[PDB]
Every structure is written in C-alpha cells, then in structure tokens.
Amino acid sequence: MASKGNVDLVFLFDGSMSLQPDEFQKILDFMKDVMKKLSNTSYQFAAVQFSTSYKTEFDFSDYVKWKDPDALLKHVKHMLLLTNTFGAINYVATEVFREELGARPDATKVLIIITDGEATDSGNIDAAKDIIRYIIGIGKHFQTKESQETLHKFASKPASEFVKILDTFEKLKDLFTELQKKIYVIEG
Numbered sequence: 001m002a003s004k005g006n007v008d009l010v011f012l013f014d015g016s017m018s019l020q021p022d023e024f025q026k027i028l029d030f031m032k033d034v035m036k037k038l039s040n041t042s043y044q045f046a047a048v049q050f051s052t053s054y055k056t057e058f059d060f061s062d063y064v065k066w067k068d069p070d071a072l073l074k075h076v077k078h079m080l081l082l083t084n085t086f087g088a089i090n091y092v093a094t095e096v097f098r099e100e101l102g103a104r105p106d107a108t109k110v111l112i113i114i115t116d117g118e119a120t121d122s123g124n125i126d127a128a129k130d131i132i133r134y135i136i137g138i139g140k141h142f143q144t145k146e147s148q149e150t151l152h153k154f155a156s157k158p159a160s161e162f163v164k165i166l167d168t169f170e171k172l173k174d175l176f177t178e179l180q181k182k183i184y185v186i187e188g
Contacts, residue, residue, distance in 0.1 A: 002108070002186060003185055003186050003187070003188050004106065004108060004186075005042045005186075005187060005188060006042060006044075006104055006106050006107040006108060007042065007043045007044065007107055007108040007110055007183075007186060007187075008044050008046070008060060008097065008103050008104065008107035008108065008109055008110060009034070009043055009044065009045045009046070009110045009112060010045075010046045010047070010048060010092050010096055010097070010110065010111045010112065011031045011045065011046070011047040011048070011112050011114060012048045012050060012054075012085070012088055012089065012092055012111055012112065012113045012114065013027050013031065013047060013048070013049055013050070013113075013114040013115075014027070014049075014050055014051065014083055014085075014113075014114060014115040014116060014117060015027075015049045015050070015051055015076075015078045015079045015080065016050075016051045016079070016080065016081060016082060016083045016115075016116070016117045017051070017080040017081060017082075018083070018116050018117045018140060018141065019078070019080075019116055021078070022169075023116070023138075023169045024078055026169040026170070026172050027114055027169065027172070028073055028076065029172065030114070030172040030173075030175070030176055031045075031047060031069065031073070031114075032069040032070065032073065033173075033176050034176065034179070034180070034183075035063075035069035035072070036069060037180060038183070038187070039067055039068075041064065042187060043187070044060040044063055044064060044102055044103070044104065044107060045058075045060070045063045045069075045072075046058060046059045046060050046062075046063065046096055046101075046102075047072070047073070048088060048091070048092055048096060049076060049077075049078075049079060050079075050083070050084060050085065050088040051079040051080065051081030051082055051083060051084065052079075052081035052082040052083075052084050052120070053079065053081065053084065054084070054087065054088040054091040054092070055077075055079065056095075056096060057072065057073060057075045057076055058072040058073070058075060059096060059101040059102055060101055060102030060103050060104075061101055061102030062102075063102070064102050082117075082120040082121075083115060083117035083118065083119060083120045083121075084119070084120060084121040085113060085115060085119035085120075085121060085154060086119050086121040086122055086123045086124060086125050086154075087121045087123060089111065089113070089125045089127070089128045089131075089133065089154070090123070090124070090125065090127045090128065092111055092128065092131070093111075093125075093127035093128035093131055094127055097109060097131065108132070108186065109130065109131045109132060110131075110132045110134060111128060111131045111132055111133050111134065112134045112135075112136070113133055113134065113135040113136065113154065113155075114136045114138075115135070115136070115137065115138065115142075116137075116138035116140040116141055116142070116169075117140070117141045118141050118142075118147050118150055119150065119154060125154065131156070132156045132162065133154055133155045133156045133162060134155070134156070134162050134164075135151050135154055135155045135162060135163050135164070136164045136166050136175065137151045137163065137164065137165045137166065138166050138167075138168070138169060139165060139166060139167035139168060142165055142166075143167075148163075148165055151163045151165070164178075
C-alpha cells in the first residue's frame with residue numbers, strides 16, 4: 001500500500017553553482033526539518049548532494065545509526081558544479097537504494113529531488129522508473145514554463161502530484177508544511 005509506514009526517503013538535493021550559500025542552507029534546513037519532525041525508524045533518510053557529480057552525504061544506515069540531521073549533514077561540502085540529475089537518479093536507483101546501505105525493500109521508495117537547475121545531463125532514468133521521483137523545481141531556472149515542463153518528465157506520475165514548482169527557497173517552509181500534511185497520511 002501507499003501508507004505502509006515504512007519509507008526510504010532519499011533527498012537528492014542540488015548544490016550546483018546556481019545555488020548560493022544561504023539558498024543551499026535553506027535546502028539543508030528543509031531536509032533537517034523533515035528529518036527532525038520524522039525522527040523515527042519508519043522514515044529512513046538518505047541525502048545525496050549533487051551537481052555534475054553525485055555525493056552521498058549520508059545513507060539509510062547512517063540515519064538509522066545516528067538519527068540526527070545536523071550530525072548526518074556534517075559531510076556537506078557545497079560542490080558548486082553543474083546539475084547531473086539523471087546520472088544522480090541512476091546512481092541513487094542502483095547504489096543508494098540497497099539493503100546493505102539500509103534500504104528496507106518494503107519501504108516506500110521515495111526520491112525527493114531538490115533542484116533550482118534543469119537536468120544538465122538528461123541521459124536516462126529508466127533505472128529509477130519504479131522509484132518515486134518527487135521533484136521540487138526552485139523558480140530560478142524553473143521560473144521558465146519550458147524549464148518547468150522538463151520536471152514532469154523526470155518525476156514519477158502523476159507529475160501533477162510529484163512536481164512542486166517552488167518560486168523561491170523562501171517557500172521551502174510552506175512546501176515542507178504541505179509535504180508534512182501529505183506524508184503524515186503515509187506514516188498514518
């Protein structure tokens with residue numbers, strides 16, 4: 001079912017050159033908020049910073065072990081490169097979503113992509129077709145309709161649900177609240 005309690009939430013969060021320190025700190029804050037509020041074993045979190053490259057900040061096992069976002073995020077070094085969303089999605093799909101790294105099979109396979117930038121790679125994401133690509137398009141490069149439309153290709157379906165155009169990092173708090181409202185029903 002959807003509301004099976006168990007959730008593997010991968011934050012595939014962008015730290016491209018496009019993001020500036022404060023903005024990126026708000027990206028951190030957002031993840032940190034979810035993690036704080038949902039500090040329980042039901043919700044396993046992982047976070048992959050990405051740009052040109054993908055960078056596992058921490059995995060499900062790490063979360064399970066430490067259960068503190070501030071600790072878990074200590075690894076964050078802002079990369080400031082391109083935005084290889086597709087390669088990072090494939091990486092996540094194959095490498096991050098593993099039992100050995102703490103991905104319980106019965107967990108809801110949630111991949112929350114946080115990006116202000118279009119997918120500079122645009123290779124494939126078939127590897128992740130079954131994984132829930134939730135995507136937050138910050139209205140910097142997703143200000144443009146043409147750019148927004150790309151999100152709906154990356155995202156899981158219905159894209160209407162899974163894509164959130166987010167005019168500014170400022171609204172991460174509002175978005176967070178909305179996501180909590182929904183995710184509450186998944187936790188039950």
